[PDB]
Amino acid sequence: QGMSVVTSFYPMYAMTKEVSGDLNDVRMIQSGAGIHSFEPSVNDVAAIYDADLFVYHSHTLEAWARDLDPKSKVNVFEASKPLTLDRVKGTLYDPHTWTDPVLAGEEAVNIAKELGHLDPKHKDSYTKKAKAFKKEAEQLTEEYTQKFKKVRSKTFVTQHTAFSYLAKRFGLKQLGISGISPEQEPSPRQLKEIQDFVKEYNVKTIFAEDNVNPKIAHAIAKSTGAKVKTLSPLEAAPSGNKTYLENLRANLEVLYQQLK
Numbered sequence: 510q511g512m513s514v515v516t517s518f519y520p521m522y523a524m525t526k527e528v529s530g531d532l533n534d535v536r537m538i539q540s541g542a543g544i545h546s547f548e549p550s551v552n553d554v555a556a557i558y559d560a561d562l563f564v565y566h567s568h569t570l571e572a573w574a575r576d577l578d579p580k581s582k583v584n585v586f587e588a589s590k591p592l593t594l595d596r597v598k599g600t601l602y603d604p605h606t607w608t609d610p611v612l613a614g615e616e617a618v619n620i621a622k623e624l625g626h627l628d629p630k631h632k633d634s635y636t637k638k639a640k641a642f643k644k645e646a647e648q649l650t651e652e653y654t655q656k657f658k659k660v661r662s663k664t665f666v667t668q669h670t671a672f673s674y675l676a677k678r679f680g681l682k683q684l685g686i687s688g689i690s691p692e693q694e695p696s697p698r699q700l701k702e703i704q705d706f707v708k709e710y711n712v713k714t715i716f717a718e719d720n721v722n723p724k725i726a727h728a729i730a731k732s733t734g735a736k737v738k739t740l741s742p743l744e745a746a747p748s749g750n751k752t753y754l755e756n757l758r759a760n761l762e763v764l765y766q767q768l769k
């Protein structure tokens with residue numbers, strides 16, 4: 510009862526699920542680490558072909574989604590079609606929009622439309638709930654755009670380049686030890702450039718993430734006089750049952766408390 514929905518990783522599962530409510534059956538492909546270097550198993554693609562809707566974030570992330578041509582009434586929906594992804598500096602694009610409350614809220618809205626478009630009978634519950642999500646997202650944005658405006662230290666160093674949009678929306682500066690993907694690891698040379706960055710901007714916290722070994726994270730910490738903490742890009746299903754925004758909110762707090 511209700512259409513089968515399938516999502517790529519955590520931010521998609523959370524959004525479509527909170528928007529659908531109890532209506533459909535939402536499932537997720539990759540709930541762990543590696544969405545960047547992930548490739549679906551034959552089983553994964555099968556669940557996609559037996560599902561009424563399969564929502565994934567982008568072609569710049571789930572590259573494997575582009576190569577799916579069904580005989581099944583399954584809809585492939587690239588939820589971040591509207592958004593305008595920034596180019597990667599240093600051409601490819603930074604897919605990390607979901608860590609930005611606004612862009613996240615407006616992508617959740619886009620899913621509500623696709624949900625409503627396939628099931629007009631309940632198009633209200635979809636749009637009704639998407640109003641809430643988007644709403645809670647503005648409230649969180651206002652709350653933190655305010656808290657960060659009171660903070661002097663504006664720079665933070667994360668495991669990889671995953672917080673460019675979040676840093677952007679709150680007037681912060683972020684530097685990743687690794688690139689857009691956790692696989693794009695730094696050479697000894699770049700390790701030096703990062704340590705010099707931490708010293709120059711006087712960063713006192715290097716934010717490791719669960720999805721990757723903090724060995725290097727800790728090394729830089731020891732050498733630049735900083736402590737290691739955890740800042741999650743929400744790419745892996747968080748422990749506990751919080752809302753997408755409450756999880757995001759949680760991290761907005763550690764960042765905030767740290768820069769303070």
Ligand SMILES: [Zn+2]
Binds near residue numbers: 670671689744
């Ligand atoms: Zn990432």
